[PDB]
Write a protein that binds this ligand. Structure first.
Ligand SMILES: Nc1nc2c(ncn2[C@@H]2O[C@H](COP(=O)(O)OP(=O)(O)OP(=O)(O)O)[C@@H](O)[C@H]2O)c(=O)[nH]1
Ligand SMILES: Nc1ncnc2c1ncn2[C@@H]1O[C@H](COP(=O)(O)OP(=O)(O)CP(=O)(O)O)[C@@H](O)[C@H]1O
Ligand SMILES: Nc1nc2c(ncn2[C@@H]2O[C@H](COP(=O)(O)OP(=O)(O)O)[C@@H](O)[C@H]2O)c(=O)[nH]1
Ligand SMILES: [Ca+2]
Ligand SMILES: [Ca+2]
Ligand SMILES: [Ca+2]
Ligand SMILES: [Mg+2]
Ligand SMILES: [Mg+2]
Ligand SMILES: [Mg+2]
Lengths: 425, 438, 54, 352
């Protein structure tokens, strides 16, 4: 009974979080009303990881929905699986955060944060043995970014020895709402460097390119982007949701994936990514080749520009475990220059028999690569292009922030980039 | 009759323990409910098998064993498994969250809070013993519990049972079946702190068991069940002298006397033959000379290394089945004229031989075929130092960068314990080279 | 090639063949190590809480 | 795509093999400390054999047989021949030798003197040579006192063996020589003799009445090219190849190189390598080995061949690098890692 408490904050956080629960509920046989209708015992074996069991054999997601405006959470409550969530676990305000990190972190967010912690505390108190937390949010907005990292800080204060995990959506000019997103993301990244154990970097720049170039979607929508995020979140949590030996829990994953405390930002990847030739059987060699392909990466960084510190791979579906080991060893032995040679046997592989919906077999990639510095460099350059002219700062100083806090965040992220660079050489 | 208490620590120790006690029951004719028809002394007795099994008034034969794990899922299988009725709940100890593959978490953070409970349960078994010999401790090197909690337990056992022998069965890490990158750290940390507390340690390299299962059992991708059923066969051969009538290795003290002339060099190499697939149409039964000759092939060793390039300090041959001394001696004569067997000058060149007429038992439906004779050779070779070098080398690669060290310091371990443990291993490798190389 | 110490019983026998002749920390100390590490953990957690209070 | 590592930058032989491996477009070189290799061109000393064959899914091959130093060490070779029944103490193709430890440190001092005193009493030629593996350090004398005193002045093990006082002298010149044979042993322990040998000839006339000047008594390529005044006179670089040497044997001795010399050379090679096969074979080992050996022979005026030593890390004649190194790739490396004639080797069949 290793329970995880899930939190989703802001527009992005709640829309991706909704799709995540929709996907895994289907995989575990839970219908929109919380009733189980599966046909395999593997579905319920580890169900309590993400679901509470209520009267009448009902399974209720251990999820807390947070926002500073009601709109998105109204949509969730009226969505496909909206009725499966605990009505008490909707915590929202009315003011909004105005795409402003300061509003989420210091003013509007500060007024609502205690009521969220009350719900978090309620869910944790009923856990047999709480593993830790997972937060879904964007870094480019105000609520998920500012209030999300505020929540992480207050959760760590109350649960200092629990694991904090996040799925963090990084902003990109190609899929942007406002010009201040580099500000909100730089402020948030520093919080994550200090207060999270594992962060899955989900780059909207990569999600767009995959949709446009690989899936041939002429005009990608946020819904198209979130289909990739749902599939990825399901893949990376498979080790937690089904019987297995590798990782299997948040702390063990962290111990195998994070050799240095600040370098806990992961490049996720998924295969196949097929456009509508969609019925063709996919071989283990193809699954393995694509899973390591940069075009299958959702961080928008080229792995061949850095080195892998650690890699976790998860194969799903009925396949040849012997062939899985062969192709994996083939990739490592054929490109051993992109794997640091001072962490022996740093590529681990796991297999799960239950494939995702509508696929015979798939592969999910989790990489701790020094190439992720390209992502932080990109944000840092966009931050500096505006900050050198103090552009748009009045939105933040109007909420009580000083310019010095921006300079410190700017320096903290450039420090992070420098740390990745030393282990790359 | 002197009792032996088995202690199984962590997933590897528990699952191997389940395979062993399953085999012990089959070898002694004990049913899953603990009943033993052939035992005419109901609720008592001092037979050889009583070294490993106590008896209740109702005739239940209870393993003298404790299972310990910091998470419940592995031991939960035992509680609801085929042999659930063998143990009473006090013998199966589980915590709620494991050591996360972190030696420091198993030894310090969690070990400090459960050690007293584990010692109390062990004391309850000791109170049933009229003449306790000591302990057999099963554990992995790589796990946070198997490494960290075992070393703490061994330290306390030396305090609470100063005059008792302690033997180890230790699983050396192999990447083919491992998924924890820090296992070299945990292996060296637990070896450093356990070295002075263990009288004799039988290391089994998962890489060796894995390849034997693929090569000899035609298993494309062996599971822990496949690995453990083979390991239990080797463990059974080693402990058979304690559980059946005989005169060789009849008590734990004799393992040290016969296999370990130098206390720190207490890691005998185990070699086992024959391993034959049950799915085979029908195999030819190997002779005494053939299975004896097989003991000097690297392919059947529990740790892959080359004994041709080391020195022997002791060598025991443990036969099971249709074997007579005449054939053993004739086989030994032939192997000396062909094999490169070099003993150290301060040890006699010879072999201690034990023969148990009962052939090996195979679990029904298992992978191993029934054979008429088998042998396990226990040899103390400097060649096993190859395993220490490999492990220390991986340790050095990661530690030079301090990779993952913060996980250990965060549990309250000092960084100096790493270098202390590593320096002890360097002195161990130097001990082997002084004994083995000219 | 000499055999010595042949012992026989109903269930087996044992002997030795010679081919060539030759040529701790106290309970108190364990407790201090466990408490010392616990103290180091508590100190690190106090610094974290201090950082979070700031 | 195969992978290999280079751990001996001073190896001319495997610098060419490495050059050829890359030219095939199917072999990739890794940093010398990367464990994920198929082939290790290991270092000469303290090659870590214990870390080979422990990589899941990688067939690993190294260019050295663990334990072959027993054959490629001066003192070790003597001890091997005297103690191994396959070779016996009465071995007819190895000069009478003794292992002598300097008095500042078993030892065969007294045994040597007994045999030495016997020759002195029987009017027989009593000239011995003292040498060791720690040399570039050789002494040739007819007095046992000088030989033993020269070794005590040193600090490493030495060997005293009979000096061939009746060597075969090439004409014109009246000069000494030795024969170098290259032998390759693959992972299956097939013994391949390179069809091409070299005679390292002395450019100075052989003088039996003066062992002080060692230019005419030592056929080493470096000694002739530094202290000899007729270097390169009769043959380029004091290296005569089999074609010219075979023609000489026919013209002068009315015989052939195959009949008079090579049959013995092939016999000696088989005897040495078969003797240690059980000790070094990698047949059932978790990694595989091959190794290139350099055998050095002497021929007396009776056309009897004597083994001088075996080199574990030999070089090769400049003219023969391309052919031999390509042969190593064909039979020793590509046989294990195939790529996507008239062999240059002579297979010495034997019983395994
Ligand atoms: N032969 C064999 N090896 C095992 C088995 N289970 C785990 N291992 C090995 O043990 C090592 C991992 O240690 P575990 O025993 O699983 O960990 P633990 O002792 O439970 O400690 P924790 O970190 O708290 O889980 C790896 O090298 C595994 O390959 C088993 O059943 N049989
Ligand atoms: N017993 C002997 N009788 C006659 N000549 C001998 C001899 N032992 C050695 N030599 C001469 O010494 C030379 C080389 O000696 P040796 O081979 O022992 O030294 P070395 O090993 O440093 C040269 P290499 O290793 O290249 O063959 C040969 O050319 C040979 O002519
Ligand atoms: N992938 C994805 N990104 C989103 C979604 N909604 C918003 N974003 C991104 O999130 C950032 C805006 O933050 P948002 O979550 O809308 O602000 P918040 O409600 O204050 O937390 C921008 O980078 C958007 O591109 C979504 O549904 N999917
Ligand atoms: Ca307000
Ligand atoms: Ca009884
Ligand atoms: Ca003791
Ligand atoms: Mg928005
Ligand atoms: Mg465990
Ligand atoms: Mg030489």
């Amino acid at each position: 009974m290793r329970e995880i408490v899930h939190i989703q904050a802001g527009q992005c956080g709640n829309q991706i979080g909704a799709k995540f629960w929709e996907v895994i509920s289907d995989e575990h046989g839970i219908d929109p009303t919380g009733s189980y209708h599966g046909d395999s015992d593997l579905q319920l074996e580890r169900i309590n990881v993400y679901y509470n069991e209520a009267t009448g054999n009902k399974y209720v997601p251990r999820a807390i929905l947070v926002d500073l405006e009601p709109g998105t959470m109204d949509s969730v409550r009226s969505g496909p699986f909206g009725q499966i969530f605990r009505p008490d676990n909707f915590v929202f305000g009315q003011s909004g955060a105005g795409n402003n990190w300061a509003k989420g972190h210091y003013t509007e967010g500060a007024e609502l944060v205690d009521s969220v912690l009350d719900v978090v505390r309620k869910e944790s108190e009923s856990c047999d043995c709480l593993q830790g937390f997972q937060l879904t949010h964007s870094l480019g907005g105000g609520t998920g970014s500012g209030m999300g990292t505020l929540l992480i800080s207050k959760i760590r204060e109350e649960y200092p020895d629990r694991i904090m995990n996040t799925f963090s959506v990084m902003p990109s000019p190609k899929v942007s709402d406002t010009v201040v997103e580099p500000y909100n993301a730089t402020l948030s990244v520093h919080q994550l460097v200090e207060n999270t154990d594992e962060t899955y970097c989900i780059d909207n720049e990569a999600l767009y390119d995959i949709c446009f170039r690989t899936l041939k979607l002429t005009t990608p929508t946020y819904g198209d982007l979130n289909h990739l995020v749902s599939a990825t979140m399901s893949g990376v949590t498979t080790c937690l949701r089904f019987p297995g030996q590798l990782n299997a829990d948040l702390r063990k994953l962290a111990v195998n994936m994070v050799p240095f405390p600040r370098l806990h930002f992961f490049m996720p990847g998924f295969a196949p990514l097929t456009s509508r030739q969609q019925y063709r059987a996919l071989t283990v060699p193809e699954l393995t080749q694509q899973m390591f392909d940069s075009k299958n990466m959702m961080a928008a960084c080229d792995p061949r520009h850095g080195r892998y510190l650690t890699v976790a791979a998860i194969f799903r579906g009925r396949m040849s475990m012997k062939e899985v080991d062969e192709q994996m060893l083939n990739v490592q032995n054929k490109n051993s220059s992109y794997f640091v040679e001072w962490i022996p046997n740093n590529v681990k592989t796991a297999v799960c028999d239950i494939p995702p919906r509508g696929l015979k077999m798939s592969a999910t990639f989790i990489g701790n690569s020094t190439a992720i510095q390209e992502l932080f460099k990109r944000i840092s350059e966009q931050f500096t292009a505006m900050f050198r002219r103090k552009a748009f700062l009045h939105w933040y100083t109007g909420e009580g922030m000083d310019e010095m806090e921006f300079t410190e965040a700017e320096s903290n992220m450039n420090d992070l980039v420098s740390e990745y660079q030393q282990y790359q050489d | 009759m002197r009792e032996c208490i088995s202690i199984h620590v962590g997933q590897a120790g528990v699952q191997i323990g389940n395979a062993c006690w399953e085999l012990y029951c089959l070898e002694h004719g004990i049913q899953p409910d603990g009943q033993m028809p052939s035992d005419k002394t109901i609720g008592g007795g001092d037979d050889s098998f009583n070294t490993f099994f106590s008896e209740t008034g109702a005739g239940k034969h209870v393993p003298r064993a404790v299972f310990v794990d910091l998470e419940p899922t592995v031991i939960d299988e035992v509680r609801t498994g085929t042999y659930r009725q063998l143990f009473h709940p006090e013998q199966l100890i589980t915590g709620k969250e494991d050591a996360a593959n972190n030696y420091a978490r198993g030894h310090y953070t969690i070990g400090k809070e459960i050690i007293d409970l584990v010692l109390d349960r062990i004391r309850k078994l000791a109170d049933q013993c009229t003449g306790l010999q000591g302990f057999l401790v099963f554990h992995s090197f790589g796990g946070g519990t198997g490494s960290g909690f075992t070393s703490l337990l061994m330290e306390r056992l030396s305090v609470d049972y100063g005059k008792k022998s302690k033997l180890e069965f230790s699983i050396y890490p192999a990447p083919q079946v491992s998924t924890a990158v820090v296992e070299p750290y945990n292996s060296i940390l637990t070896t450093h702190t356990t070295l002075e507390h263990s009288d004799c340690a039988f290391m089994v390299d998962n890489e060796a068991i894995y390849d034997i299962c693929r090569r000899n059992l035609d298993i494309e991708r062996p599971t822990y069940t496949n690995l453990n059923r083979l390991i239990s066969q080797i463990v059974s051969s080693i402990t058979a002298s304690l559980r059946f009538d005989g005169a060789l290795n009849v008590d734990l003290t004799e393992f040290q006397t016969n296999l370990v002339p130098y206390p720190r060099i207490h890691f005998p190499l185990a070699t086992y033959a024959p391993v034959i697939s049950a799915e085979k149409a029908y195999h030819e039964q190997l002779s005494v000379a053939e299975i004896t000759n097989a003991c000097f092939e690297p392919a059947n060793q529990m740790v892959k290394c080359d004994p041709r390039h080391g020195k022997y300090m002791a060598c025991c041959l443990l036969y099971r089945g249709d074997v007579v001394p005449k054939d053993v001696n004739a086989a030994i004569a032939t192997i000396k004229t062909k094999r490169s067997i070099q003993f150290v000058d301060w040890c006699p060149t010879g072999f201690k031989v034990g023969i148990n007429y009962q052939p090996p038992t195979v679990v029904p439906g298992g992978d191993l075929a029934k054979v008429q004779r088998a042998v396990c050779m226990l040899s103390n070779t400097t060649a096993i130092a190859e395993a220490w070098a490999r492990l220390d080398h991986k340790f050095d690669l990661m530690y030079a960068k301090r990779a993952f060290v913060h996980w250990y310091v965060g549990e309250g371990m000092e960084e100096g314990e790493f270098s202390e443990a590593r320096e002890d291993m360097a002195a161990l490798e130097k001990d082997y080279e002084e004994v083995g190389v000219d | 090639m000499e055999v010595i110490e042949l012992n026989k019983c109903t269930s087996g026998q044992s002997f030795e063949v010679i081919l060539k002749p030759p040529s701790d920390p106290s309970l108190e100390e364990i407790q201090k190590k466990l408490e010392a590490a616990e103290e180091r953990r508590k100190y690190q957690e106090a610094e974290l809480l201090k950082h979070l209070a700031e | 795509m195969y992978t290999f590592v280079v751990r001996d930058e001073n190896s001319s032989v495997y610098a060419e093999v490495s050059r050829l491996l890359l030219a095939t477009g199917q072999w990739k070189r890794l940093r010398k400390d990367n464990p994920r290799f198929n082939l290790m061109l290991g270092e000469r000393n303290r090659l870590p054999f214990g870390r080979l064959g422990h990589e899941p899914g990688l067939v690993q091959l190294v260019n050295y047989y663990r334990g072959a130093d027993k054959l490629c060490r001066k003192a070790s070779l003597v001890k091997l021949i005297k103690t191994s029944p396959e070779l016996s103490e009465s071995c007819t193709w190895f000069p009478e030798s003794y292992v002598i430890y300097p008095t500042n440190l078993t030892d065969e001092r007294e045994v040597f003197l007994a045999a030495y005193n016997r020759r002195r009493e029987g009017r027989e030629g009593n000239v011995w040579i003292a040498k060791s593996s720690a040399g570039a350090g050789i002494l040739i004398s007819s007095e046992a006192s000088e030989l033993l005193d020269f070794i005590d002045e040193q600090g490493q093990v030495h060997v005293i063996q009979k000096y061939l006082e009746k060597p075969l002298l090439l004409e014109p010149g009246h000069r000494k020589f030795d024969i170098r044979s290259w032998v390759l042993v693959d992972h299956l322990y097939n013994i391949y003799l390179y069809r091409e040998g070299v005679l390292r000839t002395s450019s100075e006339p052989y003088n039996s009445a003066n062992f002080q000047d060692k230019t005419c008594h030592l056929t080493n390529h470096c000694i002739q090219k530094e202290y000899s005044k007729n270097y390169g006179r009769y043959e380029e670089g004091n290296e005569m190849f089999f074609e010219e040497f075979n023609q000489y044997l026919m013209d002068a001795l009315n015989t052939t190189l195959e009949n008079s010399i090579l049959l013995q050379i092939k016999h000696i090679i088989r005897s040495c390598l078969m003797c240690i096969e059980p000790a070094i074979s990698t047949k059932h080992l978790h990694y595989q080995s091959f190794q290139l050996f350099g055998f050095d022979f002497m021929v007396d005026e009776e056309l009897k061949v004597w083994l001088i030593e075996v080199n574990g890390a030999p070089a090769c004649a400049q003219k023969l690098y391309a052919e031999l190194c390509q042969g190593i790739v064909d039979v020793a490396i590509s046989s294990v890692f195939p790529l996507a004639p008239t062999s240059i080797f002579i297979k010495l069949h034997h019983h395994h």
